[PDB]
Design a protein around this nucleic acid. Structure first.
Ligand SMILES: N[C@@H](Cc1c[nH]c2ccccc12)C(=O)O
Ligand SMILES: [Mg+2]
Ligand SMILES: [Mg+2]
Ligand SMILES: [Mg+2]
Ligand SMILES: [Mg+2]
Ligand SMILES: [Mg+2]
Ligand SMILES: [Mg+2]
Ligand SMILES: [Mg+2]
Ligand SMILES: [Mg+2]
Ligand SMILES: [Mg+2]
Ligand SMILES: [Mg+2]
Ligand SMILES: [Mg+2]
Ligand SMILES: [Mg+2]
Ligand SMILES: [Mg+2]
Ligand SMILES: [Mg+2]
Ligand SMILES: [Mg+2]
Ligand SMILES: [Mg+2]
Ligand SMILES: [Mg+2]
Ligand SMILES: [Mg+2]
Ligand SMILES: [Mg+2]
Ligand SMILES: [Mg+2]
Ligand SMILES: [Mg+2]
Ligand SMILES: [Mg+2]
Ligand SMILES: [Mg+2]
Ligand SMILES: [Mg+2]
Ligand SMILES: [Mg+2]
Lengths: 16, 117, 143, 201, 64
RNA sequence: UAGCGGCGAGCGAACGGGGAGCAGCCCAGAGCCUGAAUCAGUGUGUGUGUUAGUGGAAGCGUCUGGAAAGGCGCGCGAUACAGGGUGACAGCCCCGUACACAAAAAUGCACAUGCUGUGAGCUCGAUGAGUAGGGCGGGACACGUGGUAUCCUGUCUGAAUAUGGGGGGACCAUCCUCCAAGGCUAAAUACUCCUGACUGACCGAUAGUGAACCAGUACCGUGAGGGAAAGGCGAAAAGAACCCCGGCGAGGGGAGUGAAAAAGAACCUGAAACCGUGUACGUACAAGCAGUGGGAGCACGCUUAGGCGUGUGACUGCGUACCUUUUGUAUAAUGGGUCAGCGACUUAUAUUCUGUAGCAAGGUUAACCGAAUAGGGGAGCCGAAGGGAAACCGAGUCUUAACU
């Protein structure tokens, strides 16, 4: 499946 | 008609690895890596066939020069002499004689000096 | 001798293969170029299409009207009739000599040159030049 | 064009146009090739992705797994199941114009004489349905490999030779292009010659 | 399967003798009263499809 | 093609012609004569196929070899040289093959009849109404309502009846042609779960069926359902008695079998990535795509030396991988851990051009017949005439009253 950090929004969204 | 393939394949591959013999690590083991190593070796060669003629000429010119200076005359003047020395033409390599026959050289230097007088 | 036959030279052009390596001349991209609609499986655009611009066969007006009577009128060459078989070139008859086609109901004779054997043409129409050529070869043109 | 009738030296007299004409190699080569094609049957396998056995479920998510895209388990790129351009049974029959076929036979006959590989005879037949007989006739006639085109064809001449491998026997209509070239010598009865004479016009 | 003629084009071109195509001019179907008689006059007789469009038309009328 | 068509995309006939196969009959009814044609269901018979079967020709010598079917020699059968097998490739070793034969029983198919059911035949009659047509709404016809014939009917209607009625693509006349509103009907046509036999310029274990294998299995899923991997010792098991180390082990070494054991069952061939042992040479003052040009030394062969082959490569000139994508990439932009196997411009039908071949003002046939790649079949298609929307005219024609 996918690692938790990839699914998680705060770490992943990082630069909008 | 289905084509087996793969007997001709390792033919192509081994054809390359053989050319890679001697190279370090993957360059001699791993085709994908070897096929590159094999090409660039080729590339340098094609280049360095032309370089070879450059490298040696300046090798010759370098030692022509000391011997000339050794007989008290720069390379500049010394080739100009031989040029002007009533025509006359003679390879810069063949000035080999500078290493193996130093009287013959000095002898060539004089002949050159004379034309410059 | 069954392995000594060979075809006429230049009767069997090999034919592009493409997609097989640098040397081939048609490797990688396969003569299709780089990107765009025209590359890509099933690419291309339909006939007549010229970008979204109004196409020629639509800028220009229609002007038809199909005779339908014309479809059943044949034209006859002088070169025929000699081949009619029976010296009478008739409403059909030509039809039987396979030079008209059943459905036909009308026929002109047309100066398409060369008539020799005297022949009488019957129930057809015939041009000024054709009549003259027929008659001048001993022919007869009764309606 | 006269032909040495071999046994009862008699001469047969044949059409110069159908027995004395120049050898048109290309033109024959088209017909012999054509005949070899059409020998073919279709009969052929291979399942496009549309016909390999599996469901049409996407093997795994478009995005997310660290994996290549993947769409159908029957994809030619994948292992079991594929074949991009799977063949179908197909028909290799070529045309060959009427006038080209005839044109080839003529170039072929008119070359068999020129190598005297064609020996024409008044009558040819074996006395009983026994291979050994025919084997002897050929022996006596100095022959192993032979086509022997008979006039009307008889029972015994056929049953002999059925088992001799390099020798076949055909009636007048049975003449095909490969055979004329196939055998080392074509025999042909003078009776058959006249048949062929006309068949080719 | 046989190619299908691009039916619309069939109704706007006719193959000529040497293999040309001839068509009716545009610009002559309405809003006429304001156009010179000279202009309208020149737009009556049919005209050959140009060299540049030949490619198109032929691809539309394989059975022309 | 004619037509249909946001006259877009597309859809696409018929007339007539050549072929395959051809077949025609009942009811709407009563009288006489009566079970008379016929059809099915059925019993029997007969023939013919089927479901077990029978006979079936002819080879030996020697050489190599573990083994002959192979080579060489000399015979022999062949209506049998299809094919498989046998210690390597067999017409004559085996099983077959050609060919000739065989059915106690049960059956398919034809006829022939028995039994049942059924009606035949002649005379005189009868001739398909909630139908045709119409209105409204849809649907079918190549045809999108269009000038739209024709067909079907959900809805509301509704005739004529042989001096009658339908159709001939709006519609009318004339002409011509057919008889709706009841049915039956064989062949040419379609298909292959399955039976038999035969064939392939079809695959050969990542191929070919998912499945060459005890596979729809193991496995996954609540379930529908998904769905693998995995073939080869040898000619023959002759599949290793017995001895030794070891834990009455694992594993191993001898012995023995065999042509081979390096064919030992984790078994034909045994590649590559990858990991070791051995030897030669280099390497612990040296900086980078690791090679390339030069190049000593060392080890090894040479040669008779002779700055020669092979291996290594101090030192040294030059030198930022590949693909892709880009105006441009060492790029710190993409893709690749490595190897092996697989993995991407095909096929069919139309059309046009080039080459080439045939024939030539002609060329060629399609289906189909077939003595089946032949021969027949010219229905037809292309061309020899063009111009015009068209009638029509024709080496001209169109334009216009007419063309310099
Ligand atoms: N257990 C996780 C949290 C988590 C679980 N699943 C996730 C999916 C998406 C994001 C976060 C999570 C943690 O270490 O915090
Ligand atoms: Mg230079
Ligand atoms: Mg690209
Ligand atoms: Mg672009
Ligand atoms: Mg492009
Ligand atoms: Mg005709
Ligand atoms: Mg699906
Ligand atoms: Mg990955
Ligand atoms: Mg497959
Ligand atoms: Mg034919
Ligand atoms: Mg107008
Ligand atoms: Mg038997
Ligand atoms: Mg036998
Ligand atoms: Mg009626
Ligand atoms: Mg019926
Ligand atoms: Mg498999
Ligand atoms: Mg294998
Ligand atoms: Mg092994
Ligand atoms: Mg050091
Ligand atoms: Mg370093
Ligand atoms: Mg430095
Ligand atoms: Mg950029
Ligand atoms: Mg670019
Ligand atoms: Mg660069
Ligand atoms: Mg880096
Ligand atoms: Mg990168």
């Amino acid at each position: 499946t996918s690692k938790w950090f990839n699914i998680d929004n705060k770490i992943v969204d990082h630069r909008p | 008609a289905r084509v087996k393939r793969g007997v001709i394949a390792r033919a192509r591959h081994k054809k390359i690895l053989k050319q890679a013999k001697g190279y370090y690590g993957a360059r001699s083991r791993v085709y994908r890596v070897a096929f590159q190593a094999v090409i660039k070796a080729g590339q340098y060669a094609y280049r360095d066939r032309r370089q070879r003629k450059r490298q040696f000429r300046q090798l010759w010119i370098a030692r022509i020069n000391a011997a000339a200076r050794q007989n008290g005359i720069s390379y500049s003047k010394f080739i100009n002499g031989l040029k002007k020395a009533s025509v006359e033409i003679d390879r810069k390599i063949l000035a080999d004689i500078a290493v193996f026959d130093k009287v013959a050289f000095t002898a060539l230097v004089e002949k050159a000096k004379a034309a410059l007088a | 001798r069954l392995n000594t036959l060979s075809p006429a030279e230049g009767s069997k052009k090999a034919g592009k293969r493409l997609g097989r390596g640098i040397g081939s001349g048609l490797g990688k991209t396969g003569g299709r170029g780089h990107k765009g609609q025209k590359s890509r499986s099933g690419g291309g655009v339909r006939r007549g299409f010229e970008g979204g611009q109004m196409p020629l066969y639509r800028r220009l007006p229609k002007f038809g009207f199909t005779s339908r009577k014309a479809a059943i009128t044949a034209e006859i060459r002088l070169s025929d009739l000699a081949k009619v078989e029976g010296g009478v070139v008739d409403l059909n008859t030509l039809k039987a000599a396979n030079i008209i086609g059943i459905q036909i109901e009308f026929a002109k004779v047309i100066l398409a040159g060369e008539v020799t054997t005297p022949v009488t043409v019957r129930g057809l129409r015939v041009t000024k030049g054709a009549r003259a050529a027929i008659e001048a070869a001993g022919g007869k043109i009764e309606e | 064009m006269e032909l040495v009738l071999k046994d009862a030296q008699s001469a047969l007299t044949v059409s110069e146009t159908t027995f004395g004409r120049d050898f048109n190699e290309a033109l024959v080569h088209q017909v012999v090739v054509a005949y070899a094609a059409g020998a073919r049957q279709g009969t052929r396998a291979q399942k496009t992705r549309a016909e390999v056995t599996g469901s049409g479920k996407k093997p795994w998510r478009q995005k997310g797994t660290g994996r290549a895209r993947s769409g159908s388990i029957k994809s030619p790129i994948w292992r079991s199941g594929g074949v991009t351009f799977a063949a179908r049974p197909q028909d290799h029959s070529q045309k060959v114009n009427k006038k080209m076929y005839r044109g080839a036979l003529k170039s072929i006959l008119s070359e068999l004489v020129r190598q005297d590989r064609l020996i024409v005879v008044e009558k040819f037949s074996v006395e009983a349905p026994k291979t050994k007989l025919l084997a002897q006739k050929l022996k006596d006639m100095a022959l192993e490999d032979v086509l022997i085109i008979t006039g009307e064809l008889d029972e015994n001449l056929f049953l002999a030779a059925r088992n001799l491998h390099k020798v076949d026997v055909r009636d007048a209509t049975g003449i095909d292009p490969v055979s004329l070239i196939a055998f080392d010598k074509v025999v042909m009865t003078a009776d058959a010659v006249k048949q062929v004479e006309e068949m080719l016009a | 399967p046989k190619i299908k003629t691009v039916r619309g084009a069939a109704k706007r071109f006719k193959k000529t003798g040497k293999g040309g195509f001839k068509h009716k001019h545009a610009n002559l179907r309405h809003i006429l009263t304001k156009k010179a008689t000279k202009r309208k006059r020149h737009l009556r007789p049919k005209a050959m499809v140009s060299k540049g469009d030949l490619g198109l038309v032929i691809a539309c009328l394989p059975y022309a």
